[PDB]
C-alpha cells in the first residue's frame, strides 16, 4: 500500500547523457547509437538570441567546433545536422549502452519521468505531467537544457521531452525529440508566457480511486450523476471535460473498487463545491491531477 | 526554479538488484561484489513465521537451496551466513557493475531514495523520509521485500534501508544493510504497530526557505521569536524540538534569503496558529516536512 509520485528507474537514460560544448555555451545531449541529440541553441551566442537564423549559424560551424564528452571520454563529431529545434551531432562512437528506444510525442494530461542533468552528469529524477497548456511544472536550473523526459515499457525507453527553457511563471517548456515544441513557444528571447491552465479531470478521478484502494473513503457518497451534469460543474471550477473514453479508461479502477465512475464523479462534484472540510486524501489537502489512470494501476495493488 | 520531491538517479542501484528464491518464497536481493544481501525471512516457510529460530532454519539449509538470478543469468551460491535480519549469500560471480558504496544508518528526519523492485526487476524510484517513529511512508506491494533505499554523493552509493514489511496503518518498516531494524519492529508476525509520530520541524523550515527562493512570500512577517518560545509552540502542535544545530544548518538558506531562522520561526508559528487561510506553498496546502535543508540547497538555485 501507499501512494507516491514514482518515477521510472533512470539507469537506461543515465548511460545516454553526455555534455555538449560549442564555444562558451555548455549543455546536455542525449547519445543514442552514433547520434547526440541536443538543443540547437547550443550553437548560439548571447547576441544571436533575439532573432537568430539557425540555418545560417549552422552553416558557419564545423565539426571541430563541437565538444562532446561522455564522462571523461571525448567523442569526435563527424557530422552535424538540424531537425526543428534539435541539433543532431553524428559521432565516431556508437553508444554501447544505447537502450531499446522510441521517440514519442505525449498528450497533455500524460505523465513522464524527468532526469535532471547538468554538464552531462545526471542530478536527480522526478515525475511530471504535461499540463493542458503544454508547460511542465518541473525543477530545473541554469544548465539543465538538454535534460530529457521519458517513459519505460518492457525495457523500451520512449523519450518524449527535451528541456529548453523556463517561462516567467517558473514553469518549463521544451520539445519532443524531433525538436517540435510542446505549446506555442520558441527557442529565442521574447515575452512568451504560459497560457491559462486547467485541471486534468480524469487524473483527479484516478487519484480518488487510488485513495479508495488505500482506504480513504470519507469523500464518498451515495449519489450518482450524469456525464453531462458533471461536465457542467467541471466548467465552473476550470476542470477539463470528461469523455466517454475517460470513463472507459477508469473502468479497471471502478471494477476493483466497485465504485462506478459516475458515482465517483458525484464525489468530485461535492469536493469541488464543499471543499475538503479539513480532511486530507493520500496525504494531500488539494485535489491531485498529476497521476494518470495508468500510473494508479501500476502502483496500486489489484486487491481492494 | 521549481521544487519537486526529487530522487537520486537509480542506475548504480539497478545494476545491483537480483532475484533470490528459496523454496516457494521469492524476493529481491542486493548484489555487491560477490555477496547478495537479502531479507533473512526468504528462508522461512509460512508456518515458521510465528516465532522462527532463524539460526536453526539456516543450519538446515544448503547452498543449492538458494536460487539467485541476475536478470537471466544464474548465480551459484557458494556460501551463506546471516547478519542480524539480513542473509548474506556469497556467489561465484562478483558483480561487474558494483558501484563505490557504503552501508550507513540514517537518522529520523533524513531522506533517501527508494528503488521499488519486484522479482529482482526495478519498478520505480521515489523519495522518502525516515519518520520520527522509524517508519517510512513508502509505496510497496507484495514482493517488494529486499528493495533498498540509498543516497548518492560523488558517485558513492550510501545504502541505508532494505525493505521488510508493511505495518497495519500502511506505513513501512525495514532494516539498515547490517540487518538492524529501524524502530521497535521484528521480522515475524505480531500485532506490532507504528508508535505516535511527530512533524520534522527543521525540514518544514527548510521547505519554507525553498518557497521564499521560489517566490512564495505571503506567509512572511516582521516578527522574530526566541528559540525557547518557538519550541514551546512546537510542543502544542506535535512538532519536533528545534536545536541550535538545526539553526546552524539552516544558516546557508537564511543567508541566501536574508530571513533569519528565528524570523522564519515566527512565520511557522503563525502558520500553525492561523492555518494557511486558503493559500498554498510550493503547490501544497499542507506544511511539508520531507525535505531536509540539504535537499533544498541541492535543488534550489544559489540566487534569490
Ligand atoms: C539552457 O538553455 C538551459 O539550461 N535551459 C533551461 C533552464 C534555464 C533556467 C532555468 C530553468 N531551466 C542553457 C544553455 C546555456 C546558454 C548559455 C550559456 C550556458 C548554457 N541556458 C541557460 O542556462 C539560461 C542562462 C542564459 F545562458 F542566459 C541563457 N538561458 C536560457 O535558458 C535561455 C532561454 C531562452 C532560450 F531560447 F531557450 C535560450 C536559452
Ligand atoms: C516480502 O516480505 C515483502 O514483500 N515485504 C514487504 C511488503 C509486503 C506487503 C506490502 C508492502 N510491503 C514478501 C516475502 C514473500 C514471502 C512469501 C512468499 C513470497 C514472498 N512478503 C510478502 O509478500 C507478504 C505476503 C506473505 F507472503 F504472506 C508474507 N508477506 C509479508 O510481508 C510478511 C510480513 C512479516 C515478515 F516478518 F516480514 C515476513 C513477511
Ligand atoms: Cl530515431
Ligand atoms: Cl500492481
Ligand atoms: Cl560492506
Ligand atoms: Cl544548486
Catalytic status, residue B41: yes
**What is the nearest CA distance from B142 to chain A, expressed in angstroms?**
8
Resolution (A): 2.0
Rounded distance between C-alpha atoms, residue B179 and residue B186, angstroms: 11
Residue B11 alpha carbon to ligand 2 centre in Å: 25
- Mapped onto helix, strand or coil, the DSSP state of residue A79 is strand
Q: Which residues pair with B31 in a beta bridge?
A: B36
Rounded distance between C-alpha atoms, residue A106 and residue A128, angstroms: 12
Q: Distance from CA of residue B273 to its chain's centroid? A: 30
From the list B138, B135, B144, the residue with the least C-alpha distance to B29 is B144
Residue of A nearest to B122 (CA): A9
- Mapped onto helix, strand or coil, the DSSP state of residue A261 is helix
Rounded distance between C-alpha atoms, residue A119 and residue A143, angstroms: 7
Cell of B303: 540566487
Cell 552501508 -> residue: B103
* Cα separation values, B245 from B130, B250, B266, Å: 19, 9, 18
Strands (E), chain A: 17-22, 25-32, 35-39, 66-70, 73-75, 77-83, 86-91, 100-103, 111-118, 121-129, 148-153, 156-166, 172-175
CA dihedral A41, A120, A158, A155 (to 10 degrees): 170
Experimental method: X-ray
Q: At what angle do helices A261-274 and A227-236 cross, to 10 degrees?
A: 30
| Active site (catalytic) residues of A | 41, 145
Do residues B124 and B144 touch, judged by C-beta distance below 8 A?
Answer: no
SS (H, E, C) chain B: CCCCCCECCCHHHHCCEEEEEECCEEEEEEEECCEEEEEHHHHCCCHHHCCCCHHHHHHCCCHHHEEEEECCEEECEEEEEEECCEEEEEECCCCCCCCEEEECCCCCCCEEEEEEEECCEEEEEEEEECCCCCCECCCCCCCCCCCEEEEEECCEEEEEEEEEEECCCCCEEEECCCCCECCCCCCCCCCCCCCCCCECHHHHHHHHHHHHHHCCCCCCCCCCCCHHHHHHHHHHCCECCCCHHHHHHHHHHHHHHCCCHHHHHHHHHHHHHHCCCCCCECCECCCCCCCCHHHHHHHCCCCC
Radius of gyration for the alpha carbons in chain A, expressed in angstroms and rounded: 22
From the list A226, A224, A230, the residue with the least C-alpha distance to A260 is A224
Residue among B53, B142, B179, B194 to mutate when testing ligand 2 (max atoms within 8 A of CB): B142
Residues in B 250-289 with any Cβ partner in A closer than 8 A? 280, 283-286
Measured from the Cβ of residue B278, the count of other Cβ atoms closer than 10 Å reads: 7
CATH fold of A11-91: Thrombin, subunit H (2.40.10)
Closest ligand 2 atom to B143 CA: 4
What one-character DSSP code corresponds to residue A302?
Answer: S
What one-character DSSP code corresponds to residue A271?
Answer: H
Q: List pocket residues of ligand 1, CB cut-off 6 Å.
A: A 25-27, 41, 49, 140-145, 163-166, 187-189
* Cα separation values, B290 from A229, B90, B198, B286, B295, Å: 39, 36, 12, 12, 9
Cell 538570441 -> residue: A49
Q: Whose CA is nearest to atom 18 of ligand 1?
A: A25
Do residues B89 and B68 touch, judged by C-beta distance below 8 A?
Answer: yes
Rounded distance between C-alpha atoms, residue A233 and residue B26, angstroms: 49
β-pairing, A66-70 vs A148-153, is unpaired
Rounded distance between C-alpha atoms, residue A257 and residue A213, angstroms: 7
Closest ligand 2 atom to B142 CA: 23
* Cα separation values, B58 from A164, A256, B88, B180, Å: 56, 40, 11, 18
What residues of A are in contact with residue B14 (Cβ under 8 Å)?
Answer: 9, 11
- Largest Cα–Cα separation, chain A: 69
Of the residues A5, A11, A113, A147, the best mutation for testing chain B's interface (the one with the most B CB atoms within 10 Å of its CB) is A11
Rounded distance between C-alpha atoms, residue A132 and residue A227, angstroms: 21
Rounded distance between C-alpha atoms, residue A78 and residue B16, angstroms: 36
Q: How many CA atoms lie within 13 A of A244 on its CB side?
A: 0
The CATH number fitting domain A201-299, selected from 1.10.1840.10, 3.40.50.1820, 2.40.50.70, 1.10.230.10: 1.10.1840.10
Q: In what order do the strands lie in the sheet with B35-39?
A: B73-75, B66-70, B17-22, B25-32, B35-39, B86-91, B77-83
Catalytic residue among B44, B128, B145, B300: B145
Measured from the Cβ of residue A161, the count of other Cβ atoms closer than 10 Å reads: 25
Radius of gyration for the alpha carbons in chain B, expressed in angstroms and rounded: 22
Element (H, E) at A299: helix A293-299
From the list A13, A57, A62, A5, the residue with the least C-alpha distance to A163 is A13
Q: List pocket residues of ligand 2, CB cut-off 6 Å.
A: B 25-27, 41, 49, 140-145, 163-166, 187-189
Q: How far apart are the first and last CA of chain A?
A: 10
Q: At what angle do helices A244-257 and A261-274 cross, to 10 degrees?
A: 100
* Cα separation values, B49 from B44, B144, B164, B187, B239, Å: 7, 18, 13, 8, 37
Amino acid at each position: 500500500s501507499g501512494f507516491r509520485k514514482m518515477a521510472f528507474p533512470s539507469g537506461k537514460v543515465e548511460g545516454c547523457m553526455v555534455q555538449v560544448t560549442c564555444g562558451t555555451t555548455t549543455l546536455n545531449g542525449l547519445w543514442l547509437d552514433d547520434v547526440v541529440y541536443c538543443p540547437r541553441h547550443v550553437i548560439c551566442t548571447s547576441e544571436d538570441m533575439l532573432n537568430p537564423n539557425y540555418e545560417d549559424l549552422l552553416i558557419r560551424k564545423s565539426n571541430h567546433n563541437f565538444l562532446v564528452q561522455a564522462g571523461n571520454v571525448q567523442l569526435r563529431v563527424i557530422g552535424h545536422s538540424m531537425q526543428n529545434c534539435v541539433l543532431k551531432l553524428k559521432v565516431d562512437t556508437a553508444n554501447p549502452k544505447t537502450p531499446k528506444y522510441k521517440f514519442v510525442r505525449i498528450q497533455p494530461g500524460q505523465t513522464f519521468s524527468v532526469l535532471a542533468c547538468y554538464n552531462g552528469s545526471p542530478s536527480g529524477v522526478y515525475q511530471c505531467a504535461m499540463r493542458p497548456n503544454f508547460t511542465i511544472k518541473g525543477s530545473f536550473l541554469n544548465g539543465s537544457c538538454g535534460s530529457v523526459g521519458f517513459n519505460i515499457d518492457y525495457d523500451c525507453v520512449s523519450f518524449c521531452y527535451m528541456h529548453h527553457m523556463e517561462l516567467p511563471t517558473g514553469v518549463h517548456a521544451g520539445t519532443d525529440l524531433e525538436g517540435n515544441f510542446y505549446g506555442p513557444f520558441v527557442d529565442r528571447q521574447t515575452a512568451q508566457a504560459a497560457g491559462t491552465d486547467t485541471t486534468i479531470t480524469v487524473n483527479v478521478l484516478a487519484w480518488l480511486y487510488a485513495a479508495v484502494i488505500n482506504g480513504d473513503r470519507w469523500f464518498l457518497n451515495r449519489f450518482t450523476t450524469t456525464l453531462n451534469d458533471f461536465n457542467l460543474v467541471a466548467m465552473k471550477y476550470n476542470y477539463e471535460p470528461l469523455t466517454q473514453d475517460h470513463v472507459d479508461i477508469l473502468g479497471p479502477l471502478s471494477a476493483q473498487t466497485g465504485i462506478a465512475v459516475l458515482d465517483m464523479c458525484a464525489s468530485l462534484k461535492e469536493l469541488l463545491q464543499n471543499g475538503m472540510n479539513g480532511r486530507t486524501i493520500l496525504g494531500s489537502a488539494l485535489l491531485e491531477d498529476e497521476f494518470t489512470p495508468f500510473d494508479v494501476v501500476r502502483q496500486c495493488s489489484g486487491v481492494t
